[PDB]
Amino acid sequence: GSKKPVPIIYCNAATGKCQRM
Amino acid sequence: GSKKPVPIIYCNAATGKCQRM
Protein backbone atom coordinates (compact mmCIF):
# COMPACT_ATOMS: atom_id res chain seq x y z
CA GLY A 1 0.00 0.00 0.00
CA SER A 2 1.86 3.04 -1.32
CA LYS A 3 -0.32 4.66 -3.97
CA LYS A 4 -4.01 4.05 -4.66
CA PRO A 5 -5.58 7.12 -6.32
CA VAL A 6 -7.99 5.22 -8.57
CA PRO A 7 -9.43 1.73 -7.96
CA ILE A 8 -9.82 1.19 -11.70
CA ILE A 9 -6.72 0.89 -13.88
CA TYR A 10 -5.63 -0.41 -17.29
CA CYS A 11 -2.29 -2.20 -17.03
CA ASN A 12 -1.91 -5.21 -19.33
CA ALA A 13 1.04 -7.55 -19.83
CA ALA A 14 4.28 -6.16 -21.27
CA THR A 15 2.69 -3.77 -23.76
CA GLY A 16 2.80 -0.15 -24.91
CA LYS A 17 0.42 0.92 -22.15
CA CYS A 18 0.08 0.29 -18.42
CA GLN A 19 -1.30 2.44 -15.60
CA ARG A 20 -4.55 3.92 -14.27
CA MET A 21 -6.95 6.81 -14.88
CA GLY B 1 -17.00 -12.40 -33.22
CA SER B 2 -16.92 -9.31 -35.43
CA LYS B 3 -13.78 -7.36 -34.56
CA LYS B 4 -10.78 -8.55 -32.54
CA PRO B 5 -7.65 -6.59 -33.55
CA VAL B 6 -6.10 -6.58 -30.07
CA PRO B 7 -6.43 -9.42 -27.53
CA ILE B 8 -5.83 -6.96 -24.69
CA ILE B 9 -8.20 -4.10 -23.85
CA TYR B 10 -8.89 -1.56 -21.11
CA CYS B 11 -12.63 -1.15 -20.55
CA ASN B 12 -13.66 -0.55 -16.94
CA ALA B 13 -17.09 0.06 -15.42
CA ALA B 14 -19.01 3.20 -16.39
CA THR B 15 -16.03 5.55 -16.52
CA GLY B 16 -14.35 8.11 -18.76
CA LYS B 17 -12.47 5.42 -20.66
CA CYS B 18 -13.34 2.06 -22.22
CA GLN B 19 -11.96 0.23 -25.26
CA ARG B 20 -8.85 -1.55 -26.53
CA MET B 21 -5.42 -0.81 -28.01
Cβ atoms within 10 Å of B9's Cβ, excluding its own:
13
Residues from chain A that touch B21, judged by Cβ atoms under 8 A, are 12, 15-17
Among A8, A13, A21, the residue with its CB nearest the CB of B8 is A13
**Do the Cβ atoms of A8 and B12 come within 8 Å?**
yes
Reported as half-sphere exposure (CB side, CA atoms, 13 A), residue B9 has a value of 12
Give dist(CA B9, CA A10) in Å, integer. 8
CA of A9: how far to CAs of A16, B1, B2, B3, in Å?
15, 26, 26, 23
| DSSP 8-state code for residue B16 | S
